[PDB]
Design a protein around this ligand. Sequence first.
Ligand SMILES: C[C@@H]1[C@@H](NC(=O)/C(=N/OC(C)(C)C(=O)O)c2csc(N)n2)C(=O)N1S(=O)(=O)O
Length: 165
Amino acid sequence: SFSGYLKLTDNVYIKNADIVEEAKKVKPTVVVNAANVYLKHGGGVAGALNKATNNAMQVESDDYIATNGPLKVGGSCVLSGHNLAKHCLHVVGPNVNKGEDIQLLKSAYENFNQHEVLLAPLLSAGIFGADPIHSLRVCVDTVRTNVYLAVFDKNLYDKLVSSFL
Ligand SMILES: C[C@@H]1[C@@H](NC(=O)/C(=N/OC(C)(C)C(=O)O)c2csc(N)n2)C(=O)N1S(=O)(=O)O
């Protein structure tokens, strides 16, 4: 299903791509959302994935929170993938701009290990305020299942690749 990815390790793949467009095209078993603990999908990856579901992800998420309460930072829940995927794994990476502990990034990535294959963004990057080069390192040192990383920004993609150890 997936095409055009650079192989970084035995199990981590990366591509310069819009995760929304990739989800729509591939319809993978699991797409990862870069969520917050309230599953309020306002901006960033979450805002874009939600908009691609015509707000159906937000409606489902509102029901989830009403029933179960908020996630923990570093935690996850599995919901519908709607039109993008079979399932959406909503994962909460720490938001450095809210002062959340960057050490929880490894816990966040550990959620990915419950799924054999996933399409995902770099956790805690973008508006979550962490260094994406750090995030990718934590990814490669934590995830053991097959992860296809979609990086929207071409300059960031190039830097992630060119700096990868
Ligand atoms: C240059 C990238 C920029 N990334 C983005 O803004 C990028 N958003 O998010 C992430 C998740 C990082 C991505 O590119 O996958 C995006 C989505 S739609 C658009 N026009 N740009 C960001 O703060 N950096 S930095 O290299 O980590 O400074």
